[PDB]
PDB file of C-alpha atoms and ligand atoms in Angstrom:
ATOM      1  CA  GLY I 150       1.550 -16.685  23.349  1.00 60.61           C
ATOM      2  CA  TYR I 151      -0.397 -13.420  24.368  1.00 58.40           C
ATOM      3  CA  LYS I 152      -0.986 -10.618  21.582  1.00 59.54           C
ATOM      4  CA  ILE I 153      -0.524  -7.548  23.113  1.00 59.53           C
ATOM      5  CA  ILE I 154      -1.450  -4.002  20.262  1.00 58.12           C
ATOM      6  CA  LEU I 155      -0.479  -1.059  20.684  1.00 58.64           C
ATOM      7  CA  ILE I 156      -2.311   1.620  19.370  1.00 62.29           C
ATOM      8  CA  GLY I 157      -3.198   5.607  19.793  1.00 61.71           C
ATOM      9  CA  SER I 158      -2.521   8.860  17.691  1.00 60.51           C
ATOM     10  CA  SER I 159       0.629  10.146  15.766  1.00 60.97           C
ATOM     11  CA  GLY I 160       3.163  11.044  17.891  1.00 57.51           C
ATOM     12  CA  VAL I 161       2.404   9.257  21.153  1.00 57.21           C
ATOM     13  CA  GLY I 162       5.569   7.306  21.892  1.00 53.45           C
ATOM     14  CA  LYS I 163       4.254   4.121  21.458  1.00 50.69           C
ATOM     15  CA  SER I 164       7.006   2.813  19.372  1.00 53.25           C
ATOM     16  CA  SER I 165       9.604   4.441  22.183  1.00 53.87           C
ATOM     17  CA  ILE I 166       7.475   2.087  24.711  1.00 53.03           C
ATOM     18  CA  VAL I 167       8.178  -0.874  22.699  1.00 51.64           C
ATOM     19  CA  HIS I 168      11.783  -0.314  21.849  1.00 52.47           C
ATOM     20  CA  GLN I 169      12.410   0.525  25.548  1.00 55.94           C
ATOM     21  CA  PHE I 170      11.010  -2.699  26.443  1.00 56.05           C
ATOM     22  CA  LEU I 171      13.047  -4.074  24.357  1.00 53.90           C
ATOM     23  CA  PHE I 172      15.842  -3.041  24.590  1.00 52.92           C
ATOM     24  CA  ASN I 173      18.015  -1.084  27.486  1.00 54.36           C
ATOM     25  CA  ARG I 174      19.498   1.564  26.057  1.00 57.81           C
ATOM     26  CA  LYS I 175      18.972   4.629  24.869  1.00 57.00           C
ATOM     27  CA  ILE I 176      15.892   5.059  22.337  1.00 56.89           C
ATOM     28  CA  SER I 177      17.060   6.593  18.666  1.00 53.78           C
ATOM     29  CA  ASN I 178      15.901   4.518  15.963  1.00 55.14           C
ATOM     30  CA  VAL I 179      12.838   5.654  15.864  1.00 55.97           C
ATOM     31  CA  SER I 180       9.933   7.064  12.855  1.00 59.80           C
ATOM     32  CA  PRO I 181       5.978   7.146  12.561  1.00 59.45           C
ATOM     33  CA  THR I 182       5.333   3.683  12.340  1.00 57.52           C
ATOM     34  CA  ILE I 183       3.092   2.555   8.912  1.00 54.08           C
ATOM     35  CA  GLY I 184       2.685  -0.826   9.032  1.00 54.65           C
ATOM     36  CA  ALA I 185       2.460  -2.758  11.850  1.00 53.83           C
ATOM     37  CA  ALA I 186       5.655  -4.311  13.862  1.00 58.03           C
ATOM     38  CA  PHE I 187       6.139  -7.049  14.972  1.00 58.21           C
ATOM     39  CA  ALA I 188       8.323  -8.079  17.584  1.00 58.40           C
ATOM     40  CA  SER I 189       8.358 -11.089  20.592  1.00 58.82           C
ATOM     41  CA  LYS I 190       9.375 -11.416  24.484  1.00 55.69           C
ATOM     42  CA  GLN I 191       9.169 -13.933  26.773  1.00 53.27           C
ATOM     43  CA  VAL I 192       8.893 -12.726  30.577  1.00 50.86           C
ATOM     44  CA  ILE I 193       8.894 -14.310  33.731  1.00 52.31           C
ATOM     45  CA  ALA I 194       5.171 -13.413  35.828  1.00 53.59           C
ATOM     46  CA  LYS I 195       4.604 -13.523  39.532  1.00 53.22           C
ATOM     47  CA  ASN I 196       2.949 -16.482  39.038  1.00 52.49           C
ATOM     48  CA  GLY I 197       6.071 -17.707  37.807  1.00 52.18           C
ATOM     49  CA  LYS I 198       4.979 -19.383  34.571  1.00 53.65           C
ATOM     50  CA  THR I 199       7.327 -17.715  31.208  1.00 52.14           C
ATOM     51  CA  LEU I 200       5.357 -15.919  29.085  1.00 52.44           C
ATOM     52  CA  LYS I 201       4.892 -15.013  25.182  1.00 51.22           C
ATOM     53  CA  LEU I 202       4.501 -11.633  24.545  1.00 52.10           C
ATOM     54  CA  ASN I 203       3.365 -11.691  20.867  1.00 52.55           C
ATOM     55  CA  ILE I 204       3.203  -7.868  20.731  1.00 49.73           C
ATOM     56  CA  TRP I 205       1.679  -5.362  17.377  1.00 50.15           C
ATOM     57  CA  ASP I 206       3.330  -1.667  17.413  1.00 49.77           C
ATOM     58  CA  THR I 207       0.395   0.083  14.638  1.00 50.61           C
ATOM     59  CA  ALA I 208       0.210   3.542  13.121  1.00 52.96           C
ATOM     60  CA  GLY I 209      -1.797   5.984  14.832  1.00 56.42           C
ATOM     61  CA  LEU I 210      -1.291   8.283  11.276  1.00 57.14           C
ATOM     62  CA  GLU I 211      -4.652   8.399  10.603  1.00 56.40           C
ATOM     63  CA  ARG I 212      -4.674   8.042   6.940  1.00 54.92           C
ATOM     64  CA  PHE I 213      -2.799   4.858   7.980  1.00 54.83           C
ATOM     65  CA  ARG I 214      -6.081   3.237  10.495  1.00 58.15           C
ATOM     66  CA  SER I 215      -7.051   0.483   7.608  1.00 58.21           C
ATOM     67  CA  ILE I 216      -3.771  -0.744   8.294  1.00 58.25           C
ATOM     68  CA  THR I 217      -4.114  -0.955  12.005  1.00 59.22           C
ATOM     69  CA  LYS I 218      -7.462  -1.715  12.459  1.00 61.33           C
ATOM     70  CA  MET I 219      -6.351  -5.126  10.658  1.00 61.14           C
ATOM     71  CA  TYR I 220      -4.618  -6.077  13.989  1.00 60.89           C
ATOM     72  CA  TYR I 221      -7.380  -5.544  16.653  1.00 61.37           C
ATOM     73  CA  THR I 222      -8.746  -8.974  16.334  1.00 59.71           C
ATOM     74  CA  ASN I 223      -7.875 -11.751  18.350  1.00 59.47           C
ATOM     75  CA  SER I 224      -5.673  -9.340  20.976  1.00 62.55           C
ATOM     76  CA  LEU I 225      -6.008 -10.454  24.614  1.00 64.43           C
ATOM     77  CA  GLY I 226      -4.126  -7.173  25.929  1.00 64.96           C
ATOM     78  CA  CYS I 227      -4.294  -3.800  25.034  1.00 62.26           C
ATOM     79  CA  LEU I 228      -2.028  -0.409  25.478  1.00 62.07           C
ATOM     80  CA  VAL I 229      -3.508   2.285  24.652  1.00 65.27           C
ATOM     81  CA  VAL I 230      -0.702   5.712  24.739  1.00 66.33           C
ATOM     82  CA  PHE I 231      -1.643   9.365  25.071  1.00 67.83           C
ATOM     83  CA  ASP I 232       0.863  11.784  25.424  1.00 66.42           C
ATOM     84  CA  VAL I 233      -0.377  14.360  28.395  1.00 69.58           C
ATOM     85  CA  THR I 234       0.902  17.475  26.101  1.00 70.98           C
ATOM     86  CA  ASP I 235      -1.789  16.534  23.414  1.00 74.59           C
ATOM     87  CA  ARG I 236      -5.208  17.131  24.627  1.00 75.46           C
ATOM     88  CA  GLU I 237      -6.385  15.742  21.048  1.00 74.88           C
ATOM     89  CA  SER I 238      -4.648  12.910  21.746  1.00 73.84           C
ATOM     90  CA  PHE I 239      -6.489  11.913  25.017  1.00 74.06           C
ATOM     91  CA  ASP I 240      -9.794  12.804  23.161  1.00 71.93           C
ATOM     92  CA  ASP I 241      -8.557  10.457  20.763  1.00 72.52           C
ATOM     93  CA  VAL I 242      -8.737   7.392  23.296  1.00 73.95           C
ATOM     94  CA  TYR I 243     -12.176   6.833  23.845  1.00 72.02           C
ATOM     95  CA  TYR I 244     -12.286   6.535  20.310  1.00 71.78           C
ATOM     96  CA  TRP I 245      -9.363   3.966  20.082  1.00 74.93           C
ATOM     97  CA  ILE I 246     -11.335   1.483  22.458  1.00 73.30           C
ATOM     98  CA  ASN I 247     -14.828   2.306  20.965  1.00 75.86           C
ATOM     99  CA  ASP I 248     -12.958   0.924  17.341  1.00 71.95           C
ATOM    100  CA  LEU I 249     -11.772  -1.872  19.272  1.00 73.04           C
ATOM    101  CA  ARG I 250     -14.413  -3.229  20.807  1.00 72.20           C
ATOM    102  CA  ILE I 251     -16.144  -3.041  17.215  1.00 72.49           C
ATOM    103  CA  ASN I 252     -13.690  -5.390  15.721  1.00 72.64           C
ATOM    104  CA  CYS I 253     -12.492  -7.401  18.678  1.00 69.49           C
ATOM    105  CA  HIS I 254     -13.815  -9.382  21.661  1.00 72.29           C
ATOM    106  CA  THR I 255     -11.318 -11.143  23.199  1.00 71.47           C
ATOM    107  CA  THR I 256      -9.404  -8.524  24.872  1.00 73.97           C
ATOM    108  CA  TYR I 257      -9.041  -9.536  28.627  1.00 72.27           C
ATOM    109  CA  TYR I 258      -7.335  -5.797  29.628  1.00 72.69           C
ATOM    110  CA  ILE I 259      -7.356  -2.806  27.966  1.00 74.58           C
ATOM    111  CA  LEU I 260      -4.724  -0.633  29.819  1.00 74.33           C
ATOM    112  CA  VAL I 261      -4.409   3.443  28.958  1.00 72.76           C
ATOM    113  CA  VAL I 262      -1.166   5.533  28.946  1.00 74.37           C
ATOM    114  CA  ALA I 263      -0.474   8.462  30.214  1.00 72.69           C
ATOM    115  CA  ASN I 264       2.708   9.243  28.013  1.00 71.94           C
ATOM    116  CA  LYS I 265       5.455  11.728  28.013  1.00 75.41           C
ATOM    117  CA  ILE I 266       5.224  12.474  31.839  1.00 80.55           C
ATOM    118  CA  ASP I 267       8.945  13.715  31.657  1.00 78.56           C
ATOM    119  CA  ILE I 268       7.528  16.933  30.641  1.00 79.01           C
ATOM    120  CA  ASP I 269       6.561  19.509  32.601  1.00 81.68           C
ATOM    121  CA  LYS I 270       3.581  19.670  34.552  1.00 87.01           C
ATOM    122  CA  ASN I 271       2.564  22.823  34.047  1.00 85.66           C
ATOM    123  CA  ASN I 272       2.679  22.104  29.466  1.00 83.64           C
ATOM    124  CA  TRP I 273       0.049  18.811  30.373  1.00 80.53           C
ATOM    125  CA  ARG I 274      -3.268  19.526  29.065  1.00 81.60           C
ATOM    126  CA  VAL I 275      -5.223  16.921  31.252  1.00 81.99           C
ATOM    127  CA  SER I 276      -5.335  15.945  34.552  1.00 81.60           C
ATOM    128  CA  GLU I 277      -4.860  12.910  36.673  1.00 80.83           C
ATOM    129  CA  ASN I 278      -8.109  13.452  37.855  1.00 83.14           C
ATOM    130  CA  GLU I 279      -9.816  13.472  33.770  1.00 83.66           C
ATOM    131  CA  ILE I 280      -7.899  10.307  32.759  1.00 84.10           C
ATOM    132  CA  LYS I 281      -8.918   8.365  36.324  1.00 80.99           C
ATOM    133  CA  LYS I 282     -13.001   9.554  35.787  1.00 79.75           C
ATOM    134  CA  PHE I 283     -12.596   8.549  32.019  1.00 77.62           C
ATOM    135  CA  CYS I 284     -10.916   5.118  32.651  1.00 76.81           C
ATOM    136  CA  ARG I 285     -13.799   4.555  35.567  1.00 73.41           C
ATOM    137  CA  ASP I 286     -16.698   4.453  32.678  1.00 74.53           C
ATOM    138  CA  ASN I 287     -15.019   2.836  30.221  1.00 72.72           C
ATOM    139  CA  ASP I 288     -13.383  -0.495  32.107  1.00 74.00           C
ATOM    140  CA  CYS I 289      -9.828   0.003  30.797  1.00 74.33           C
ATOM    141  CA  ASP I 290      -6.980   0.929  33.891  1.00 74.09           C
ATOM    142  CA  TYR I 291      -4.375   3.740  33.333  1.00 72.96           C
ATOM    143  CA  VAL I 292      -0.646   4.423  34.083  1.00 70.78           C
ATOM    144  CA  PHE I 293       1.678   6.854  33.633  1.00 68.95           C
ATOM    145  CA  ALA I 294       4.716   6.695  32.216  1.00 71.37           C
ATOM    146  CA  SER I 295       7.934   8.813  29.525  1.00 72.59           C
ATOM    147  CA  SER I 296       9.529   5.751  27.108  1.00 70.17           C
ATOM    148  CA  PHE I 297      12.399   7.903  28.050  1.00 70.34           C
ATOM    149  CA  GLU I 298      12.719   6.396  31.250  1.00 70.09           C
ATOM    150  CA  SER I 299      12.728   2.448  31.770  1.00 68.45           C
ATOM    151  CA  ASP I 300      11.768   1.891  34.680  1.00 67.11           C
ATOM    152  CA  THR I 301       8.139   3.598  33.749  1.00 66.74           C
ATOM    153  CA  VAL I 302       7.678   0.718  31.140  1.00 65.20           C
ATOM    154  CA  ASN I 303       9.172  -2.152  33.014  1.00 67.63           C
ATOM    155  CA  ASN I 304       6.148  -0.670  35.010  1.00 67.31           C
ATOM    156  CA  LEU I 305       3.623  -0.681  32.497  1.00 65.71           C
ATOM    157  CA  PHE I 306       4.196  -3.862  30.478  1.00 68.56           C
ATOM    158  CA  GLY I 307       4.332  -5.888  34.451  1.00 71.21           C
ATOM    159  CA  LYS I 308       1.057  -4.423  35.012  1.00 71.47           C
ATOM    160  CA  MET I 309      -0.372  -6.064  31.537  1.00 73.42           C
ATOM    161  CA  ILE I 310       1.828  -9.183  32.005  1.00 75.46           C
ATOM    162  CA  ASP I 311      -0.338  -9.371  35.589  1.00 73.27           C
ATOM    163  CA  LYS I 312      -3.214  -9.632  33.982  1.00 73.84           C
ATOM    164  CA  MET I 313      -2.478 -11.667  30.949  1.00 72.23           C
ATOM    165  CA  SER I 314      -0.958 -14.171  33.028  1.00 70.85           C
ATOM    166  CA  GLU I 315      -4.317 -14.416  34.854  1.00 72.11           C
ATOM    167  CA  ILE I 316      -5.797 -15.857  31.699  1.00 69.91           C
TER     168      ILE I 316
HETATM  169  N1  GTP Q 585       8.893  14.378  25.839  1.00 67.34           N
HETATM  170  C1  GTP Q 585       9.345  13.269  25.078  1.00 67.34           C
HETATM  171  N2  GTP Q 585       8.775  12.713  24.468  1.00 67.34           N
HETATM  172  C2  GTP Q 585       9.060  11.160  23.504  1.00 67.34           C
HETATM  173  C3  GTP Q 585       8.736  10.477  24.929  1.00 67.34           C
HETATM  174  N3  GTP Q 585       8.100   9.092  23.929  1.00 67.34           N
HETATM  175  C4  GTP Q 585       8.256   9.662  22.801  1.00 67.34           C
HETATM  176  N4  GTP Q 585       8.669  10.490  22.523  1.00 67.34           N
HETATM  177  C5  GTP Q 585       9.451  11.585  21.137  1.00 67.34           C
HETATM  178  O1  GTP Q 585       8.045  11.467  20.774  1.00 67.34           O
HETATM  179  C6  GTP Q 585       7.874  11.350  19.128  1.00 67.34           C
HETATM  180  C7  GTP Q 585       7.527  10.137  18.256  1.00 67.34           C
HETATM  181  O2  GTP Q 585       7.800   9.241  19.324  1.00 67.34           O
HETATM  182  P1  GTP Q 585       6.847   7.623  18.598  1.00 67.34           P
HETATM  183  O3  GTP Q 585       7.641   6.753  19.656  1.00 67.34           O
HETATM  184  O4  GTP Q 585       7.550   8.235  17.049  1.00 67.34           O
HETATM  185  O5  GTP Q 585       5.718   7.504  18.823  1.00 67.34           O
HETATM  186  P2  GTP Q 585       4.156   7.062  17.793  1.00 67.34           P
HETATM  187  O6  GTP Q 585       3.327   6.952  18.744  1.00 67.34           O
HETATM  188  O7  GTP Q 585       4.906   5.651  17.687  1.00 67.34           O
HETATM  189  O8  GTP Q 585       3.966   7.713  16.699  1.00 67.34           O
HETATM  190  P3  GTP Q 585       3.431   6.883  15.655  1.00 67.34           P
HETATM  191  O9  GTP Q 585       3.691   5.437  14.897  1.00 67.34           O
HETATM  192  O10 GTP Q 585       3.179   8.212  14.426  1.00 67.34           O
HETATM  193  O11 GTP Q 585       1.660   6.318  15.225  1.00 67.34           O
HETATM  194  C8  GTP Q 585       9.945  11.008  18.793  1.00 67.34           C
HETATM  195  O12 GTP Q 585      10.294  12.086  18.503  1.00 67.34           O
HETATM  196  C9  GTP Q 585      10.160  10.396  20.205  1.00 67.34           C
HETATM  197  O13 GTP Q 585      11.189  10.735  20.814  1.00 67.34           O
HETATM  198  C10 GTP Q 585       8.516  10.547  25.814  1.00 67.34           C
HETATM  199  O14 GTP Q 585       7.902   9.677  27.119  1.00 67.34           O
HETATM  200  N5  GTP Q 585       8.762  12.005  26.161  1.00 67.34           N
HETATM  201 MG1   MG Q 586       5.283   4.460  15.726  1.00 64.11          MG
END
């Protein structure tokens, strides 16, 4: 299988994204993550291979960082999620990626997820240009999503799946 972790500050929607990827309904059973939670899903990649995604959904709360840190190692893909209205959550992305890289040398693809795009654009606290510029400087990709819109979750996992299939 392919180890994928979701990291990012508390409340950005990591668990909502994972539940949407796993289940085809409205999401409703979500509380803050403490210990990392595991799920697996087998998917057909564009090259026709079946890939098993081994997914760990980790805690964003600051007091639980010493749990989340124990899940970095041996990750092949990472989704780093932030909330477009939560400026601190965006500033935190740099440090999430920095910390992952201190602890893990195996990641092949880091995808920054700008989440909660359903919120009115005039309430966003980060611009598309800032997001693109950040990623251009930090050897990572970006995508825009809303946990409540399955089309955006299918898309962001599709990008991750395509990259895993290149390994
Ligand atoms: N408007 C909006 N709210 C969202 C979206 N995704 C998640 N939320 C809400 O944000 C809150 C936090 O979502 P979670 O999925 O628990 O966030 P998390 O990143 O897993 O948080 P931690 O486990 O504490 O790190 C919930 O009330 C969600 O319903 C989204 O795309 N748009
Ligand atoms: Mg969570």
